[PDB]
Each structure stands twice: as C-alpha cells, then as structure tokens.
Amino acid sequence: YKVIEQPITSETAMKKVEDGNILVFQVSMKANKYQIKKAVKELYEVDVLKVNTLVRPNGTKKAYVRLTADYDALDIA
Amino acid sequence: AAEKKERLTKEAAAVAEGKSKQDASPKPYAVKYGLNHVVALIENKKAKLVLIANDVDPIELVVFLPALCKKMGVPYAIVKGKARLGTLVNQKTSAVAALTEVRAEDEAALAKLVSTIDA
Amino acid sequence: AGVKAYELRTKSKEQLASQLVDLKKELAELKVQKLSRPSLPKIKTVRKSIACVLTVINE
Amino acid sequence: GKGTPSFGKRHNKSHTLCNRCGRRSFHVQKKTCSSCGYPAAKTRSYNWGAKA
Amino acid sequence: AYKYLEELQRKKQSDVLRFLQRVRVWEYRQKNVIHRAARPTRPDKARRLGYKAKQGFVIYRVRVRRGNRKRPVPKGATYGKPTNQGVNELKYQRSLRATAEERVGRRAANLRVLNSYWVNQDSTYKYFEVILVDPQHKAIRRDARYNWICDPVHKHREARGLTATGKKSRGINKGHKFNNTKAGRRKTWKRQNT
RNA sequence: CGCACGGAGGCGAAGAACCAUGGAUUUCCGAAUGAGAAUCUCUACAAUUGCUUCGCGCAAUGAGGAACCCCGAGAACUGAAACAUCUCAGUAUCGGGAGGAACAGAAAACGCAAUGUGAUGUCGUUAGUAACCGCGAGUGAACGCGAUACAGCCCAAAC
C-alpha cells in the first residue's frame, strides 16, 4: 500500500546524491511520479522539484526525485 | 374460440361478460378459486358460470374447460387478463380459472349475461 | 520485550502513524553506522517492532 | 536438424518460467504450460507415463 | 386432479395440444440451450415428479440435438471385426434426456434436480423440462418433502452427475428382482459394465 | 536471535526463546475474480446462477486431495500356437463429479412352487454349477443358505 519503500542505496545513488541534489528509492510500481513526490516530501522537509521514474529490472520501481536547491542529500533523517 | 368484445367484458367475469358482478357473489355467496377448484364445480354442476382468462400460459390447465363445460352445459366466459379475473375473486394473485357456483345477489345480471354469450 | 502488542492495538491509527516512524528512524539510522559498528538486539527488535505495528493497522 | 550448428543458433525466447508453476515451462509461443496447469485451472499431469 | 394434462399429453397430435405445439417451440426453437420457465409445461408431471410453487424451485427447458450419433472415428487398427469402431450407426446409451438433465445443473451450479421429462419436439431437438431445487434456501429446507434433496449436499451432491435421478436410475437400471443381474447390485460399476 | 556450528552485533529477570489458544497485519495475480502480465503493472464476487429492497443488497459455483467411490468415453500388444467373432477388457488411458466413505435400498422382488422368503450392501458358500462360445480357445452368474449389520419412511392425487 505504501508508495514509499525504503531508500535505494547504491553507487549510482550516491553519485546522484552528490552531483545532483538527490535521489532515492522506490517502490510501488503502481505509483505515479506525483505520488512519489508528495510521499517524498511527506517524509522529510524538503521540496522535491522533479522525480523521474524507472522500471528496474528488479521487479520494483525506482524513482529518483531530486530536491529543490535547498536541501542536501539527507543520508540521515 | 368465440371472441369477446370489450364491453361484454365488464358486467360478469364469471358470465360471458367481464368481471364486475363477479365481485358480487364473493360478497354475496359462492365462487371458486383456481382451475382446480373451478373444474370440480363443473364436474358436479354447481357453478352457473365460470370464467377463463384469455392469456393463460402454456398452462393448458384451462384447456379442457371448454368441452367439459359444454357437456355439463355450464356457460363459461373468456376474460382478458388473468389478473382481471383473479382480482374479482378476492385474490392478490391472478388466476386463470373461474367461478361462481351460487352467484348470490347477481342471480340477475348473471344469467342475463350468459344469454349474451351463445345468443 | 519492549513495545509488546498491548500498547499497540490500543493506540489510535494516528498514534500508530507515530511510533512507527519513531522506529523507522532509529532503525534505518542504526542501519547506517551499522556498517560503522554492528548492532545487537536493537535492530532486530526494531524490526519486528516495526513489523508488528504494520500488521496491526493492516491486520 | 542435427546440431551443427544449425540448431542452437536459434536465439529466440521460449519456455520461460510460468507465473504459477515455478518451472520455467511456459512457452511464449504456446500459451501456457509444459509443466503443470495453464490453460487448465487445476494441476497438470497426464497419464503418458505413470500407471494409475 | 390433473388428469387430462396427462391424457392430453399422450397424443400430442390430438387437437389443442397440437395447436399449442404449432405455436410453441416456434419460439422455443430460436431459443438456445438454457432458458428458464415460470411454470412447467405440463403441470401434472411437475407437481408429480416433484415441483410445487415454492421459492427455491426452478424449472428450465433444455433442447438437445435430434438424433443420436455424432461421433469421432477411430484411428488406425480399425481392421478387425471391427469391434469398437463404426461410425454413424452407433447410438449413445445416455438418453437425450439424461443429457438434458445435466446440461442443466451445469447452468445452475448451485442447484440439484429432481428431473421431469420432456415435452415433445420435432424435426430435430427434443426438449425436456427439468426442475431443479436449490439447496441453501429456505422453504426448500422446510417442507419435509423437498427436504433431503439438500442435506445440505452431504451425500447427494451433483445428483445427475453421479446419476441418481429419475431417467438415470433408469436407463442403466429398471426393475428389481430378476433382470437386476449385471445391473444394479448397486450398478454397472461392480458387476463390471455390461 | 529457523534449517545453518560464521563474522559482527543484539534480545532476555520490564520473564525472552519455545508451545497452546485467540487477535492484528496480511503486496500483486488468482480456482485467482476489476483489467492486463513468464510472480509484475494499470485505473471492481470476473464468469454462470438463485433470491431479490432489482443494488452484487443476500447467497451459490470454480480449485485441491494418497488412493478409495460414482457417472460417462474406450484401445492395442496379447491369447486362440495364423486369424476375422471370441480373448486380453469394459482392462490401460481419457472426460465429468461426490464423500469421509461413496454408490444401493424398503419389491410392478424371489420361484429350494410354497399353507414358503420378505429393503440394501458386503463376507463365506452355492460353483467353475446354469448360461455363453469357430460350441475352438476361452468366458461365466444368480435364487438359496451361513454370517455381518439391521430401520424404516416422505410425496403426487382424491377430499
């Protein structure tokens, strides 16, 4: 039911959370990229400018949202 | 068979006519219900008139009412609407069947009407 | 022991969506720095703890 | 015909894992099967073998 | 009480019955397998075999085919007597009666059937009525009669599937003592099929 | 801190592990059921059907199961020292379906023919008897009896 899943941490991920503000994990194949946006922001206080999408392969979803010029890569709630 | 005119069908459902006086005779005395009981009355000539719905299903319950009405010599009428003669007898449900053994009260309009049929 | 499902199930859904992030953070946070130093029953405690909470509201 | 190659070269996907039957079994040029079930909604058997 | 609807359904060519037969199946024909019906066609026979107005009762027509044959041909190894071989000559043992009863029942999965029998049909298909019951219903599970055709379905289940019915339990059995050899000890199974 | 004997770390006397019972949670497809899909994805009892407040509102069916049981479809090798009927065999295999057992079952019976028996299975026997058959090879009961267990009833119609 939850749109969120847990952060996706990988080498590709850390680079994005480096150059590029951010990115993440995801879940809910049946999630849009608005849903992952709202439930991104709902989690922490940052505005997520744009979230892409990405099937996988993994059988899950990936969506890396990047923040909005005001928040860093959290890597810590 | 013979064709009734929607004028005769008024007056007595039991008689050739349509139901009206047929409500009388229940309030007055005598009637039958369905095909089963009505058939009995013809058998033991008790009913002056009996009616039959035109609609009928493929029931053919009312299939031997005629010829077995015309032996006994009981005049019987056709009504249109099983419901119509269903309602005159006090019945929520309609009945293809017939009636009036005694024909109380309307021993008058009834029997006058019978004359109309088979005039 | 710890949370023990008594307190859970007693609590409201909103409360449930509280104490479900309480463990979450101290959880994932243990996961980070887990690499730093490992954890003993804590993570593993927190999981299970968190686990139970989910299957409460989602029973 | 006989492996030459003349066969084996065929690089087409077929007979992948079926959704509900762990075995690959299900072809893609077919509909479903070559192991239990699908199309039949049951289990697949066949007495081509085991005596009953 | 319902005599002549018995009497009448004898000739089927007598008079009134025949005319209804002219206009009957005209509609039934051009009506496919599976129908349904408010009342049975013969009221004596329903309400004979077992049919009463009551909730939980449903009677359906059925059509079938006409003649019996329609069969596949054997593969090779035909040469022989031939034994089981043949083509259009063989008639299938099940009646186009028994066939009507199922092919009903497998329409309504839920309900079982005490089976009525056909009305006649021409140039092709025969018909049949077929009352069914309904097991988990009320009034059905009330009247002692028309109980036990639902207990709730512990033993009787897909009656007429197994076979236990009217036409079936006939067909593959009739009579009692005498000529019940190589027939129902219970039946064909046991005392290997005749 | 499962199988699972590791490394790290953690839980337990705030009585954990583990067991019983009850509850919570219980993604997607589905027998699989909103729809599609190689276990993912996209925005609702699918389908058939009964009742029906005619709305999926109340319900049913679907699939599984070691074999057993019931109803249908039904070979050939083989045997006859060939082979066609016969035989293998209503077997193998196939289709449909029930239950914890099925199926049968209270005589339009039996027929030791009787002033006699008295629902039905099953077991023993009757008996390789009667019967069948290139009258070849082969095939093959039943009534009765001794047992086991026993239990008899409801409609349609008349009124």
Nearest partner of B35 among B19, B22, B47, judged by Cα: B47
Considering CB atoms only, which of C24, C29, C58 is closest to A76?
C29
| Number of folded domains that form chain C | 1
Chain E: give the shortest CA distance to residue B105, in Å.
31
Closest nucleotide C1' to the C-alpha of E55:
F51
> If you count them, how many residues does chain D have?
52
Chain E: give the shortest CA distance to residue B58, in Å.
6
Do B and E touch, counting CB pairs below 8 Å (3 needed)? Answer: yes
Which residue blocks in chain E are alpha helix, DSSP H?
Answer: 4-11, 16-22, 25-28, 98-101
Resolution in A: 11.7
- Distance of alpha carbon E170 from alpha carbon E152, whole angstroms: 25
The CA-atom distances, in angstroms, between A19 and each of A8, A40, A45 are 17, 20, 20
Instruction: Find all residues with CB under 8 Å of D8, minimum gap 6, and list them.
Output: none
D18 marked as binding residue: yes
CA of E110 to C1' of F68 (A): 26
- Distance of alpha carbon E118 from alpha carbon E42, whole angstroms: 9
* Torsion, Cα of A29, A35, A37, A41 (10° steps): -110
- Distance of alpha carbon C56 from alpha carbon C20, whole angstroms: 11
D20 marked as binding residue: no
Could you tell me if A76 lies within 8 Å of chain C, comparing CB atoms? yes
Amino acid (one-letter) located at E74: P
Chain A: give the shortest CA distance to residue C4, in Å.
24
Contacts of A7 in chain C (CB under 8 A): 28
- Distance of alpha carbon C49 from alpha carbon C41, whole angstroms: 11
Instruction: Find all residues with CB under 8 Å of E104, minimum gap 6, and list them.
Output: E34, E60, E62, E113, E130, E132
Domain that holds residue C56: 1-59
Between chains, do C28 and A75 touch, taking CB under 8 Å as contact?
A: no
Instruction: Find all residues with CB under 8 Å of C53, minimum gap 6, and list them.
Output: C3, C8, C16, C19, C20, C23
- Distance of alpha carbon B113 from alpha carbon B13, whole angstroms: 10
D28 marked as binding residue: no
Q: Return phi, psi of residue A58, to 5°.
A: -170, -25
- Distance of alpha carbon A26 from alpha carbon A5, whole angstroms: 5
Q: What angle do CA B41, B45, B46 make, to 5 degrees?
A: 65
Instruction: Note whether E128 and E173 are within 8 A (CB).
Output: no
Instruction: Note whether A48 and A41 are within 8 A (CB).
Output: yes
Contacts of E1 in chain B (CB under 8 A): 36
Instruction: Note whether D7 and D14 are within 8 A (CB).
Output: no
CA of E17 to C1' of F143 (A): 48
- Distance of alpha carbon C58 from alpha carbon B7, whole angstroms: 72
Partner residues linked to E62 by β-bridges: E128
> If you count them, how many residues does chain A have?
77
Nearest partner of E49 among E114, E101, E2, E97, judged by Cα: E114
Considering CB atoms only, which of A1, A6, A77 is closest to C29?
A77
Could you tell me if A7 lies within 8 Å of chain C, comparing CB atoms? yes
Partner residues linked to B51 by β-bridges: B77
User: Which chain B residue has its CA at the smallest distance from E9's CA?
Assistant: B60
Strands D25-26, E58-59: parallel, antiparallel or unpaired by DSSP?
Answer: unpaired
Instruction: Note whether C40 and C30 are within 8 A (CB).
Output: no
Closest nucleotide C1' to the C-alpha of E86:
F74
Instruction: Note whether A65 and A23 are within 8 A (CB).
Output: yes
Contacts of E8 in chain B (CB under 8 A): 60, 63-64
Helix (H) / strand (E) element for C15: namely helix C13-16
Instruction: Note whether E133 and E113 are within 8 A (CB).
Output: yes
